[PDB]
Symmetry: C5
Subunit: 147 residues, 5 copies
């Protein structure tokens, strides 16, 4: 009866990933929701992964009520940092719309590691918790609208 | 009488109130009805409209149009620019792909000051503008017989 | 003679008049006829063309092409490059997905000065260029027998 | 022998000539045949390829590949970035979604000086590079038996 | 034993070799096999994977995953961000729409220096990272039973 979420975490920056995951798990536990955690190398493969889960579900696999995308992108000198954020979020958005699924976006895109922590920590901006809660809210709306 | 779904990303509460106030006032004056659904951020507004559409296709409330409200204030983190681009990008695709009337009231400003200049109905009234746009689009949807 | 639908985003009233004047001159000059539909902003131009396409598939007016007109001036707020990007993005995709003739006259400028330099038929004439591009695309569409 | 469609966005005539010369040369050298269709700007190149594909699916000329030729020179207007992004973005989706071989010779430069360095066959020969890329992709299209 | 398709955009030959060496080393170390196909630039990598997918649906080599390798160095021209943007964008959509395992080794850097810091297996080894990312995705694709 409790929603079962799939947390797809891009573990590029491990310590930041743990902050986000701790934020997300905290919010889900707190809400009485259960979850599975899957780790991917970077934000770029987060959408594909949710896609794998959806197709998996259609093949009798675990059926997730929603998803929590966790990740961190720190703009350094390279332009690929803009690309990771943009493409991962872009694909997630399209995904949430095209598949009409509940997705909490916890993909952090900051200038430096200092703000990354400010957003990743549950003690701070708690983006991971905000994302997990966002997924729940969307799970509720998805249910309300009878999508 | 058109019945709209107002989807507000209530990130900044005060601003959200201003925008919603603008949207509601504009629709009231046009004699249009509406429901208000709340989401945490602009990023979930498009999926929300999607939910509404699927629900409608499942016998649920059928909406004539949508008013998306939200506010994104660019501070320091590169995270603000993405919220604006995606939400509005997704809304644009959605309006086209689904051929629906969408008033885009997702405010993307530099700082809180201009946010209020745009959010307040006494000012630029972005919320009202978006609501009116939805009505205009609802009318065009009907004129072309879409 | 080709019959085009001119979809103008009337945000800046005077600049819209300039683009519209430019678009009409080019079409009148070419002998093409047209209807003009007005929307509040560039963001609703793609959906409007979408409405017209579905309207036509429902026995409504069949347009040979489209001329999208609009102007976005990048001021101080971040709510400008998004309008042009998304409006143009959806227009391009629409032209490919639906294989239709679309003249893109959505003007994206840094300031009011270039807006006028591009919007005036007497100058850059962005509207006429878009109108002419639409006609060109109508001819190519027929030439390829698409 | 592969037969390709060169779609040239002829906005800057001289540069267009340089790019076209480069593309034709590369195609001639490879013993490939080609048709040339001209469009006003890079923005209509993707729809044009789309017209040709639908045309082909209606018994029209069947092309083995495409060579998109164009030039965008970034100056002041933000519309220059849009043309570059949109045309190239649509071409890419088109190459993927339709599984066709496309050589991208849409030159996006800062100034005219570098435009010539890239456009001239004697120089960087962007046109020939795009023509050669199209050929390469045609061969690959066949190697995979897609 | 997974069989991957390495699609390398060989624009800067030496850097391409660094990335390929990094990709093969990672795949050989995992016991995975692979075929290597060369394209002229990052813009054709997505269409190439598309070719491989179709070819597979026509009884061609069935790949368990893909490793996209390439390098884009941002200079003065704006044609650099577009190559990285579109290629990566196309790859991302492809991986989602086709539910395929794709390791993105398309290196987007500002200068030759970071290009070398990332392409060398001895250093950041983006080629190996992409290859390993592809393997991880292959494993996940199977764990989820997609
Ligand atoms: O999640 C992230 N992934 C990153 N890797 C890119 C991509 O997400 C994939 O892991 C890999 O490129 C191949 O799929 C990042 N950077 O490279 O900087 C980053 O900041 N964040
Ligand atoms: O509506 C907004 N949402 C924001 N959050 C992003 C997103 O809309 C979602 O709430 C959440 O990311 C997970 O879905 C914002 N910022 O982060 O700055 C903002 O300014 N405005
Ligand atoms: O056509 C324009 N519409 C604008 N409005 C945005 C949008 O096009 C819609 O009118 C409205 O947002 C709700 O749909 C603009 N700005 O806001 O700056 C602009 O410059 N040009
Ligand atoms: O090919 C180009 N077309 C341009 N026109 C834009 C577009 O390609 C179409 O021609 C027209 O806008 C209507 O579709 C350009 N600029 O405006 O600068 C440019 O630099 N290059
Ligand atoms: O892989 C790359 N291809 C490049 N060429 C662009 C494109 O990838 C194709 O090779 C060609 O344009 C025709 O499709 C690059 N630049 O132009 O700079 C680059 O840096 N990297
Ligand atoms: Ca750790
Ligand atoms: Ca009809
Ligand atoms: Ca001046
Ligand atoms: Ca045929
Ligand atoms: Ca097969
Ligand atoms: Ca250095």
């Amino acid at each position: 009866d409790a929603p079962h979420l799939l947390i797809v975490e891009a573990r590029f920056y491990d310590d930041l990933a743990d902050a986000l995951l701790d934020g997300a798990k905290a919010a889900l536990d707190e809400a009485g929701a259960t979850y599975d955690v899957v780790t991917v190398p970077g934000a770029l493969e987060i959408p594909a992964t949710i896609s794998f889960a959806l197709d998996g579900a259609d093949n009798g696999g675990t059926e997730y009520d929603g998803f929590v995308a966790l990740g961190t992108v720190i703009r350094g000198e390279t332009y690929h940092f803009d690309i990771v954020s943009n493409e991962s979020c872009r694909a997630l958005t399209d995904l949430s719309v095209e598949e009409s699924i509940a997705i909490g976006n916890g993909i952090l895109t900051v200038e430096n590691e200092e703000q990354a922590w400010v957003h990743a920590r549950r003690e701070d901006k708690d983006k991971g918790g905000f994302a997990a809660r966002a997924a729940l809210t969307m799970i509720g709306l998805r249910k309300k609208f009878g999508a």
